[PDB]
């Protein structure tokens, strides 16, 4: 997608959001609060996935072109809970900022024509290959508020996804919502964690198709990975072309009863073969 990742209200107006520079420099400040309300149109690829009946927020997702939305598989299909949502059970809401209000002349509601779950999705064990695509019934018209994120290529994947570098999760806290057993869009900047520390920190068997971001419980940081929505976008800005790239999809978070624990994310580039195939073969 030629114009992907350049936000109409920032990169296009040559404006910078409050914390993108810290992201570009991988800068870790001594400050404790690392999460805040999102500025208007800071994350315009942000999608809400809704159950039609009863109406309710199921998951996050992201816009990757006028016809395609990306999310996590376990948002749509999860047999242990008898979860199998059809195209006909769901709506997507794009261009939103506040959760608890319909936002006319800003947001757009689309129907789904078809769902594509990764064939090797593994719910039995660890949510390996936790990825799905949703083809919109109708192409959606872009605005200042609705704009697709880029997907990484080989070189972008290689430079950007390294332990120590900093990405960004946006969402309305649905990872918190599901498990405690806040209405404006949240942004949190989180660093990518070394693989052995991700391995060490969780009980799940992690695979190379996953990465984790967040802070050691050492530093008192209260920038939370659970501000994410399951299915939602983990993004990073390239210092080479000024574009936003979706490097991750929120799969789960650890200690969403406030712990300062890592979020786990589907490694998008690693599954790009499947993504491209459905987009190329089953699209236009």
Swiss-Prot record:
The record marks 31-32 as: Cleavage. Disulfide bonds join 4-150, 59-75, 198-212, 226-256. Changing residue 31 to Q: Loss of cleavage by factor Xa. It comes from Homo sapiens (Human). It comes from the Eukaryota. The chain holds residues 333 to 622 of 622 of the full protein. Residues 213-235 are annotated as: High affinity receptor-binding region which is also known as the TP508 peptide. Changing residue 48 to T: In FA2D; Himi-1. This is Thrombin heavy chain. The active site is at 74 (charge relay system), 130 (charge relay system), 230 (charge relay system). The lineage of its organism: Eukaryota, Metazoa, Chordata, Craniata, Vertebrata. Glycans are attached at residue 84. Changing residue 54 to T: Confirmed at protein level. Residues 32-280 form the Peptidase S1 domain.
